[PDB]
């Protein structure tokens, strides 16, 4: 990916004199942070693009919804009645999604959760752990996104990241092994942000831009369910085949009712 800025000279003089900005570090600061913003949102999109639709198969009570953890369904939340005993049932459901992923990957249970604001918030407004039915103001986590997208550690086990631009209420559970190979999605940085500059002699107006190269790949046993590869030699880049709704270390459930 790459970008070019090409600011003007008379602007640099006027901006320096009037406001006090620089007009050069500004666009460089704009360009540098823009590209890393794409990549940071790029990897996350693949993760939700590759997660298996959760709460199905062996993580589903005989019949409740097959796909969504409805808060208004008696079957789903353990016949619970009041608020402080109903948010607790969500913890049990997520716990089920952790062991199932361990079953499909055979390397470990999920230990990081990607959820929208509300789902993260509803975890911060209940007592996570062996305790009576309780609820209150959100104190444990940082549902604020301006500070940082890192809610904290839920149950000492899960790492809860907040999805900023999440369209609906949902959570995605995944596993990350200590070895870098055991991830399920590979980010491959090839070349860092190389800065470029130049100036056309017809205007002398400076032109600058940035260029970078990176790669993305999936774990070989991403489709763990089939017992043989596709065509021996295969393309590790994600597509509508290797990764869409088939990757193993990612389960995603849409939460409705909150």
């Amino acid at each position: 990916r790459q970008l070019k800025a090409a600011y003007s000279i008379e602007l640099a003089q006027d901006l320096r004199a009037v406001h006090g900005m620089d007009a050069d570090a500004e666009l460089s600061g704009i360009l540098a942070t823009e590209i890393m913003l794409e990549i940071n949102r790029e990897v996350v999109d693949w993760i939700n693009y590759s997660a298996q639709v959760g709460k199905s198969g062996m993580t589903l009570t005989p019949g409740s919804k097959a796909g969504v953890f409805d808060f208004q369904d008696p079957i789903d939340i353990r016949g619970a009645r009041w608020a402080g005993e109903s948010f607790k049932a969500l913890l049990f459901q997520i716990d089920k999604e952790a062991v199932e992923i361990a079953r499909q990957t055979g390397r470990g249970e999920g230990n990081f959760i990607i959820a929208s604001r509300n789902v993260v918030n509803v975890l911060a407004s209940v007592d996570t752990g062996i305790s009576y039915a309780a609820q209150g103001l959100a104190t444990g986590f940082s549902t604020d996104t301006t500070k940082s997208v890192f809610a904290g550690v839920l149950g000492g086990k899960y790492r809860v990241y907040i999805d900023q631009y999440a369209k609906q209420d949902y959570f995605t559970v995944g596993y990350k092994g200590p070895n870098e190979m055991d991830a399920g999605i590979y980010y491959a940085p090839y070349v860092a942000l190389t800065p470029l500059r130049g100036s056309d002699p017809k205007n002398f107006q400076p032109v600058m831009g940035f260029k970078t190269r990176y790669g993305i790949g999936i774990n070989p046993f991403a489709e763990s369910a089939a017992q043989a590869p596709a065509s021996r030699i295969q393309s590790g880049m994600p597509s509508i085949l290797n990764s869409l709704g088939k990757n193993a270390y990612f389960r995603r459930v849409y939460v409705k009712g909150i």
């Binding site: 942070t33 990897v43 996104t145 997208v149 900023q164 790669g215 774990n219």
Partner: protein, 52 residues
């Protein structure tokens, strides 16, 4: 008589200092410049970082 008047409560007039009386203002005082905050990055400890 000598009235200080006021701007016509118009964005152009207020910016330029043009009044409707005698005294003409220099211009609005600079209260400061407000940018837009930089959104955060959601880690990279949820995937592989193998370099090429």
């Amino acid at each position: 008589a000598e009235i200080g008047g006021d701007h016509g409560y118009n964005a152009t007039n207020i910016a330029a200092g043009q009044t409707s009386g005698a005294v003409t203002q220099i211009g609005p005082a600079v209260m400061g410049m407000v940018r837009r905050a930089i959104p955060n990055l959601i880690a990279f400890d949820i995937c592989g970082v193998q370099p090429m």
